[PDB]
Amino acid sequence: PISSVS
Amino acid sequence: SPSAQELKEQGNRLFVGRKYPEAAACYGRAITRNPLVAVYYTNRALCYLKMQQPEQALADCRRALELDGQSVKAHFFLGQCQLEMESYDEAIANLQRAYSLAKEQRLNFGDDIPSALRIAKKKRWNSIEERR
């Protein structure tokens, strides 16, 4: 998803 | 003595473990080592959102945007912050901008951005109904 860390 | 990258990776592990204040502290340590990396701030912003601290998350989004004005995630998380702080018009603008930037950059986040947009517009409308 977009709500995830990189 | 870990590197900035090692600190980010540790933060990410703690985030997976749902240890958000601990993860945020790790990203802070990464920032100390290299404060010019946008991802450390967007990662920490997400932690602050999970910790129900949208003010702190917002400041991190501002720091990320200063470093990378095209950041999809910084705009998205900024919108989320503004939503929590009941700044609906700004929230919607930032989520729309995140959507546009994701398109321009040919990034695929599935329906995440449109779903957040719908939530934001619904919240905005509901706030209007709550006042009449």
Task: Give the integer Cα–Cα distance in Å for B7 and B9.
Answer: 5
Task: Give the integer Cα–Cα distance in Å for B29 and B103.
Answer: 33
Nearest by Cα to B57 from B81, B74, B40: B81
∠ CA B11-B64-B101 to the nearest 5 degrees?
A: 110
Tell me the nearest-neighbour CA distance from A5 into chain B, angstroms.
5
Decide: residue B70, CB within 10 A, 0-12 exposed, 13-18 middle, 19+ buried: exposed
Decide: residue B36, CB within 10 A, 0-12 exposed, 13-18 middle, 19+ buried: exposed
Nearest to A5 among B15, B76, B109 (CB): B15
Nearest to A2 among B11, B12, B76 (CB): B76
CATH number, domain of B75, equals 1.25.40.10
* Domain count of the fold of chain B: 1
Q: How was this structure determined?
A: X-ray
Nearest CA in chain A to B99: A2
DSSP state of B81: H
Size of interface A-B (CB pairs under 8 A): 23
Chain B residues within an 8 Å CB radius of A2: 72-73, 76, 109, 112-113
| Residue B70, domain extent | 1-132
Task: Give the integer Cα–Cα distance in Å for B8 and A5.
Answer: 9
